[PDB]
Swiss-Prot record:
Gene name of the record: CRYBG1
Highest taxon of the lineage: Eukaryota
UniProt similarity note: Belongs to the beta/gamma-crystallin family.
Domain annotation Beta/gamma crystallin 'Greek key': ranges: 1-37, 38-93
Function of the molecule: May function as suppressor of malignant melanoma. It may exert its effects through interactions with the cytoskeleton.
Transmembrane segment boundaries: none
Identification of the protein by name: Beta/gamma crystallin domain-containing protein 1
Amino acid sequence: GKVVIYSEPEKCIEVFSDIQDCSSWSLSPVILIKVVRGCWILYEQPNFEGHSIPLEEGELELSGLWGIEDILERHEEAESDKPVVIGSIRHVV
C-alpha cells in the first residue's frame, strides 16, 4: 500500500512501509492523510502502541488531540495549536 501525508495542506511525506517511530516528525495542527491504496493504522505511540486510528483507502483531515476531551467532543474534532503527533504507522499487509 501507500499513504501520503500533507503536513501543510504541496509537499508530503510518502509512506510505503511500516514506521515504528514517527514521533520525531514535526507536522501541523491540521494535516491531510491520504491513503492511496492498502490499509494502514496510525498509532499514538512508537512501536504500534497507544490509541489507534485504522485507515482504508481515502482522505482524512486529521487534527486535534488523542483520546477524549469531553467539553469539546460534539460537533467536530477540536483543533489544537500543537502539531499533530503520530507515534508510529503500521502498514497492513
